[PDB]
Design a protein around this ligand. Structure first.
Ligand SMILES: [Zn+2]
Ligand SMILES: [Zn+2]
Lengths: 164, 372
């Protein structure tokens, strides 16, 4: 077994990363629901993935996903700010507290929309911006990717395993 | 892909995930509960499986409803399956407030009885070819109840109308409302956990602490009264309706003075420690206390808590438009007479009018229609 939980601000696209990866293709209509996924990947590991979509606003229901978790992918959108902040103030406080010993990959999502059309006086989480955070909250590894391109997408799930 | 194509890809999504959901529930009943009957005693099964059988009943009827609605109409009465089932779904309140201890109990029986541990492996092979443990399965309903809002959210943003969309948007609010009641049944569960601890240790105590609402802060202070007017080291519990002044040693706490917040008011006034003080004063009489704290920070926390307590006892608009609103614990499923969403939780969810008997959230009091 290996329990891996994908957590962070809604829309960034958790559901999607998970469906990109497991489905091995982008679908978009992009489904809302992603069932708990129990899989074999390659060294043969039994890999479990958990979406946390729809749990984000309900502070007493949401940490019910954290027990016996082997590793946490915390995510922000590389094209938000809104999210990147909440990593420091909400998600890391909560993971650390609920699970003092479980490691954390920090995942920057949407490297593809990273390079695109600042009206709102803001900037995309860049690679230094990211790792400064990763470092600040004691990450095990920092990554980036998109669900569309699937670039680095395969790296994330190899590193989540590596850490376990 | 149109918006219309998109709209019709997720009415499918609603149906297939719901199908899969009732399937899982069926699986938990059939490949798990019924076999384990058989090894385990009633108590232990009651404990592990919570109200899962009932969830199964609720959702199969609901799947029927959903099917007919989606298939028979041109999808138009969908909103109304959701609205109709909202309050029957509060049963998730108990599931989510009991699932951690259902999980823990399973572990324990598991470790105590390896014939049970074997059967468990047997069971999840029979059921999902060993891909999911019974523990895993037990988190599923919590996941599911918190997805209806996102589904209808999605079905809203590819919805064609006016009128179709509004009552989908209604159906969304019913589902976000439910999620929130469920978030608060759990918070209240554990708030009540913490009160029970306050009760058990310890007591010269004659009523259930629950009667004075929710804990605010508790800790060590020295105190003066009119009757006794040198500094006494004490341990105090602040709840919404009362301060419990205790004497303080061990795990034992001895109740030595009980203050009713209804009748008291906070008035304030070295950076040498224990210098930092405010007063609680009676209005129609003559009791009064000086509360001393080790530290300005400690003052300062306690005052805010005192102010939150009294604001709960005596909120903005407790007397608007005729009413006389009181902190109340509703023991029956109840909605707000202004906003019409639910009062959330199992414990002091909001306010009742001592004259109307009307029910309302703290934030909705000025908006309640006038009474008679
Ligand atoms: Zn009234
Ligand atoms: Zn209200």
């Amino acid at each position: 077994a290996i329990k891996c939980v994908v957590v962070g601000d809604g829309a960034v696209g958790k559901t999607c990363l998970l469906i990109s990866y497991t489905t091995n293709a982008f679908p978009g209509y992009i489904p809302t629901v992603f069932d708990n996924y129990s899989a074999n990947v390659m060294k043969p590991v039994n890999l479990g993935l958990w979406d946390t979509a729809g749990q984000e606003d309900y502070d007493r229901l949401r940490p019910l996903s954290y027990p016996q978790t082997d590793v946490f992918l915390i995510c922000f959108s590389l094209v938000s700010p809104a999210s990147f902040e909440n990593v420091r103030a909400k998600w890391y406080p909560e993971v650390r507290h609920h699970c003092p010993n479980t490691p954390i990959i920090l995942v920057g999502t949407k490297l593809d929309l990273r390079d695109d059309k600042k009206e709102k006086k803001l900037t995309p989480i860049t690679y230094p911006q990211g790792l400064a955070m990763a470092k600040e909250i004691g990450a095990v590894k920092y990554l980036e990717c998109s669900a569309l391109t699937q670039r680095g997408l395969k790296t994330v799930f190899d590193e989540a395993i590596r850490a376990v | 892909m149109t918006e219309y194509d998109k709209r019709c890809c997720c009415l499918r999504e609603i149906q297939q995930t719901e199908e899969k959901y009732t399937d899982t529930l069926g699986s938990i009943q059939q490949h798990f509960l019924k076999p384990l009957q058989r090894f385990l005693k009633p108590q232990d099964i009651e404990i592990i499986f919570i109200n899962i059988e009932d969830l199964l009943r609720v959702h199969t009827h609901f799947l029927k409803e959903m099917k007919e609605a989606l298939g028979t109409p041109g999808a138009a009465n969908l909103y109304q399956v959701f609205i109709k089932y909202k309050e029957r779904f509060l049963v998730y309140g108990r599931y989510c407030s009991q699932v951690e201890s259902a999980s823990k109990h399973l572990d324990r029986v598991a470790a105590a009885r390896e014939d049970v541990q074997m059967k468990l492996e047997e069971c999840s092979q029979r059921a999902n070819n060993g891909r999911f443990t019974l523990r895993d399965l037990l988190m599923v309903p919590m996941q599911r109840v918190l997805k209806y809002h996102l589904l209808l959210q999605e079905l809203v943003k590819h919805t064609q109308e006016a009128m179709e969309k509004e009552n989908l948007r209604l159906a969304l609010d019913a589902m976000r409302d439910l999620a929130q009641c469920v978030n608060e049944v759990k918070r209240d569960n554990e708030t009540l956990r913490q009160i029970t601890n306050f009760q058990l240790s310890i007591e010269n105590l004659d009523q259930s602490l629950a009667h004075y609402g929710r804990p605010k802060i508790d800790g060590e202070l020295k105190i003066t009264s009119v009757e006794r007017r040198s500094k006494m080291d004490r341990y105090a519990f602040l709840l919404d309706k009362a301060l419990l002044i205790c004497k303080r040693r061990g795990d034992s706490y001895d109740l030595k003075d009980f203050v009713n917040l209804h009748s008291f008011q906070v008035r304030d006034d070295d950076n040498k420690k224990w210098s930092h003080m405010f007063l609680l004063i009676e209005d129609q009489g003559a009791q009064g206390y000086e509360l001393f704290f080790k530290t300005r920070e400690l003052k300062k926390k306690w005052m805010e808590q005192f102010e939150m307590a009294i604001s709960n006892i005596y909120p903005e608009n407790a007397t608007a438009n005729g009413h006389d609103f009181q902190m109340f614990s509703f023991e029956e499923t109840t909605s707000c007479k202004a906003c019409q969403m639910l009062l959330r939780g199992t414990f002091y969810q909001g306010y009742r009018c001592h004259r109307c008997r009307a029910s309302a959230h703290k934030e909705c009091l000025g908006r309640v229609p006038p009474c008679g």
